[PDB]
Design a protein around this nucleic acid. Structure first.
Ligand code: ZN
Length: 264
DNA sequence: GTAGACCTGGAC
DNA sequence: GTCCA
DNA sequence: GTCTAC
């Protein structure tokens, strides 16, 4: 899940929990709770608070309660669902919040990588993990200029620069490869070796890609945007623009898909 | 930079 | 049995 | 998806 997936979850979950008051919280896999460290304290501070709103910052979901904010990261398998407290839980359910009306919010995560933090509202943006986070791609904060300042100062690949959440928030393996394809730029190339015409071009393809994926409810990998993917997950398949077999190597320590003729 | 963690169930 | 994200 | 260790 990247910005489009996390943003879709946000729009689809808010109306199912707004106004509900928390009555109890249960943890079946402690390590998921990062702050406060003691999972018993995390559970007790939320009791009695009402869900007032739900926001997003990069790839993080930000639950807004009475005085606190709950910060949740889904990593690779994390998923949410609301249901009746009288029915059986699905497997791999590690954290559950029970509301005073008999319903509950369930969090599942097969690999157990997800994380959760909670702080008073006014302190959330000044502390980890949201503190040293970059600007939103669909906002004036992100521009061709703000993308150059960072590129003209490093040897690392251009893909390695886009995966970094401090540079720009929200992009992942799927949308980084797609964006670089639409811009005609090889992923393994140096960030400093990019011209101005390329920078602006890359900025424009990232905005148009993230925007499109959102209007389609994200992509279903592992939702209808996966039908619009050009390179991701298409090793040894004819390119949609030129017909050259898509290739797959390894850049920045991650699997990488690209077209050898279209990108350069 | 690229293995190596942190975990687990479908792929081949 | 075993390699993958 | 991220963080850490040669
Ligand atoms: Zn091509």
């Amino acid at each position: 899940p990247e910005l489009p997936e996390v943003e879709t979850i946000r729009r689809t979950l808010l109306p199912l929990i707004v106004g509900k008051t928390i009555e109890d919280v249960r943890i079946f896999w402690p390590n998921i709770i990062r702050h406060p460290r003691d999972s018993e304290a995390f559970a007790a501070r939320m009791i009695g608070q009402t869900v007032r709103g739900l926001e997003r910052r990069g790839k993080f979901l930000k639950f807004l309660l009475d005085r606190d904010a709950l910060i949740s990261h889904l990593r690779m398998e994390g998923r949410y669902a609301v249901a009746s407290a009288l029915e059986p839980l699905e497997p791999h359910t590690h954290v559950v919040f029970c509301f005073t009306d008999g319903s509950e919010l369930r969090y599942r995560d097969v690999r157990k990588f997800g994380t959760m933090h909670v702080y008073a509202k006014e302190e959330a943006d000044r502390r980890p993990p949201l503190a040293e986070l970059g600007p939103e791609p669909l906002s004036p904060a992100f521009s061709p200029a703000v993308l150059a300042e960072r590129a003209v100062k490093t040897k690392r690949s251009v893909k390695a620069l886009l995966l970094d959440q401090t540079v720009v928030a929200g992009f992942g393996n799927i949308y980084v490869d797609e964006s670089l394809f639409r811009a005609g730029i090889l992923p393994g190339r140096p960030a400093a070796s990019l011209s101005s015409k390329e920078i602006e071009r890359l900025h424009e393809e990232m905005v148009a890609t993230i925007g499109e994926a959102v209007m389609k409810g994200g992509s279903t990998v592992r939702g209808t945007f996966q039908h619009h993917l050009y390179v991701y997950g298409r090793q040894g398949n004819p390119c949609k623009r030129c017909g050259t077999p898509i290739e797959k190597t390894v850049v920045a320590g991650r699997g990488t898909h690209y077209c050898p003729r279209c990108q350069r």
